[PDB]
Write a protein that binds this ligand. Structure first.
Ligand SMILES: Nc1ncnc2c1ncn2[C@@H]1O[C@H](COP(=O)(O)OP(=O)(O)OP(=O)(O)O)[C@@H](O)[C@H]1O
Ligand SMILES: [Ca+2]
Ligand SMILES: [Ca+2]
Ligand SMILES: [Ca+2]
Length: 341
DNA sequence: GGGGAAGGATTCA
DNA sequence: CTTTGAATCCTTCCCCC
């Protein structure tokens, strides 16, 4: 099959440039402020002008400002980004009915029935890029290959504002020369476990005892990597349906006082119920981040949908359970809804 | 023995 | 004193449907 993956470039920061054109060419840093003190929080994303200097996703705002004190720092406006995203995703549906929106700035299109070979696929990619740029003024990077994993890898290799095809021969080459830590789904934790087994390339996963691999990184990831190594990886492009929606918020001051936490929890519940919109959850989990950054949760599943009134009384019961089964103080508190009707 | 659901922790991004 | 949303993975346990 032929897969065409679209990845919006430094998306949040690019949208802010689209809304304020004079920002282009200047380092722009979109931040997620937490409210614990002046500039507390981290960078959500930065444009390349900022990344060039080390200011990137994940570094503390305070740190970023030490590197680029005169950069433009903007608060994250997720709603705006989500609406621009939605409009771009609609443009993409016009190129294939088989589309998988993987996130706010990523989507896979199965274009097998639209093009005959990679040359045509490439031309369709330029067409898609021109279209998005024309309608929304947003640049994207297109990756094209035989399956979702290599289509994503192609985009990783070509971003920003690029387009790349990874034909069958290059797939075989990558299976031998690509750093396994660069394979989608393999984060830091897994990359290190793999490194401790002397595995640095997909190909390496074949010449090892399966139970040794499975025992180290889990059965699912082991089978996943081996299938990629056997060039036998296959996963169809399917419509994504979110399976859980929730919100967890950092508090003013750590605590284990029920009456003092209710407000924050109820806040997360109202914001969660807003995002649900029509979706009716049968399950609820209360999640707490401890003073020392540990994450603990308690949940419950009901035989029917959970009205917000039910969510309110039940969340307290679940938070009480955590408070009781854990001596530590809570830093962050939130709720998570799932098992939608 | 193993399907399948539920409760939690882990991992990815 | 870095976010923080969501899927994935690991155990346990019921049940023989
Ligand atoms: N610790 C983290 N590591 C990686 N991604 C994170 C983390 N915390 C949040 N994210 C979310 O992931 C986004 C980064 O994912 P990813 O690396 O796939 O984006 P991208 O398309 O490469 O990046 P960009 O938007 O910066 O151009 C941001 C947000
Ligand atoms: Ca992106
Ligand atoms: Ca992304
Ligand atoms: Ca833990």
């Amino acid at each position: 099959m032929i897969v065409l993956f679209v990845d919006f470039d430094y998306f949040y920061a690019q949208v802010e440039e689209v809304l304020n054109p004079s920002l282009k060419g200047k380092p722009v840093v979109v931040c997620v402020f937490s409210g614990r003190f002046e500039d507390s929080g981290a960078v959500a994303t930065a444009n390349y002008e900022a990344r060039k200097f080390g200011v990137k996703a994940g570094i503390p705002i305070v740190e970023a400002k030490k590197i680029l004190p005169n950069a433009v720092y903007l608060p994250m406006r997720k709603e705006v980004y989500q609406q621009v995203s939605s409009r771009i995703m609609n443009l993409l549906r016009e190129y294939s009915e088989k589309i998988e929106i993987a996130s706010i700035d990523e989507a896979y299109l199965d274009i097998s029935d639209k093009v005959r070979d990679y040359r045509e696929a490439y031309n369709l990619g330029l067409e898609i890029k021109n279209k998005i740029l024309e309608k929304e003024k947003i640049t994207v990077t297109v990756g094209i290959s035989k399956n979702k994993v290599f289509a994503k890898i192609a985009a990783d290799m070509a971003k920003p504002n690029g387009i790349k095809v990874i034909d069958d021969e290059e797939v075989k080459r990558l299976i031998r020369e690509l750093d396994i830590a660069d394979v989608p789904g393999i984060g830091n934790i897994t990359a290190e476990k793999l490194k401790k087994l002397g595995i640095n390339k997909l190909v390496d996963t074949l010449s090892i005892e399966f139970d040794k691999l499975k025992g180290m990184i889990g059965e699912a990831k082991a089978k996943y990597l081996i299938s990629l190594a056997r060039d036998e990886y296959n996963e169809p492009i399917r419509t994504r349906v979110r399976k859980s929606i929730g919100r967890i918020v950092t508090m003013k001051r750590n605590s284990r006082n029920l009456e003092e936490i209710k407000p924050y929890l109820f806040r997360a519940i109202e914001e969660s119920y807003y995002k649900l919109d029509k979706r009716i959850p049968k399950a609820i989990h209360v999640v707490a981040v401890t003073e020392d950054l540990d994450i603990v949760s308690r949940g419950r599943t009901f035989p029917h949908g959970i009205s917000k009134e039910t969510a309110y009384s039940e969340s307290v019961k679940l938070l009480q359970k955590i408070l009781e089964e854990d001596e530590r103080k809570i830093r962050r508190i939130g709720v998570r809804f799932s098992k939608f009707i």
